[PDB]
Amino acid sequence: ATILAEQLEAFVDLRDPILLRPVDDLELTVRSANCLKAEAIHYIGDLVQRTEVELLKTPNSLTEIKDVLASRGLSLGMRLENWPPA
Amino acid sequence: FGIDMNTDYTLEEVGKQFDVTRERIRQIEAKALRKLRPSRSEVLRSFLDD
DNA sequence: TGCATCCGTGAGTCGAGGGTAATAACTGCTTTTACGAGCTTGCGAAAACTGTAAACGCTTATCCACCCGTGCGAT
Predict the structure, then answer these.
(1) CB A62 within 8 A of CB A52
(2) Which family does it belong to (chain A)?
(3) Distance C1 C1' – A24 CA (angstroms)
(4) Contact A75, A48 (CB under 8 A)
(5) Within 10 A of A26 (CB to CB), how many other CB atoms are there?
(6) Cβ–Cβ < 8 Å for A83, A50
(7) How many Å apart are CA B11 and CA A25, to the nearest integer?
(8) What SS3 string covers chain A?
(9) What is the three-class DSSP state of B28?
(10) Chain A residues touching B38 at Cβ < 8 A
């Protein structure tokens, strides 16, 4: 008599997606493929955390990355949070 | 690989036409596999399970 | 004009479980076909190395005008 009384309750009262991608989806130069992996840069979104005052001292592009971001609608030097969640 | 044709060429036969390089025709082919090795490969990885 | 031989018919779905066995020659002799063995080209790789227009970071030579090196002045 409690299962019956509550089945009558419908009768009475109720009547960025581009961020986490790997780095080889941008057609970058192979001289940078010896540069980005040396710093252990693994993510596209990690590359925006490592700003333009972080990357240039690897041996063997500063203007080219500004072209490849402005083509597909992004920016450099973003501050991210809870990243990477993996 | 004879795609869209009826034959199979060699490095020399393709080298007979365009340029007479030998090891870099082999290095042109090996470069394109790196140009196709995992964002475009998501559709072609499904044909592995034959 | 019967009479006698003959050719051609005979519902539909499913179903289960499977395939056989009687008996047959030896010899010497000569030609054809396969199998492994051992080379000869040749064809796709690995590991070096000589030509160019940009090829990663980075100094100067300039020009000039915001700002202000200072002084002196505004009520």
Answers:
(1) yes
(2) Belongs to the RNA polymerase alpha chain family.
(3) 106
(4) yes
(5) 15
(6) no
(7) 30
(8) CCHHHHHHHHCCCCCCCCCCCCCCCCCCCHHHHCCCCCCCCCCHHHHHHCCCCCCCCCCCCHHHHHHHHHHHCCCCCCCCCCCCCC
(9) helix
(10) 22, 24
Helix (H) or strand (E) holding B13: helix B11-17
Query: Resolution (in Å) of the shown entry?
Result: 3.4
Q: How many residues does chain B have?
A: 50
Q: Does B2 touch chain A (CB under 8 A)?
A: no
Nucleotides of C under 7 A from a protein CB: 42-48, 55-58
| Nearest-angstrom CA–CA distance, A74 and A48 | 10
A25 vs B: CB within 8 A: yes
B7: DSSP letter: S
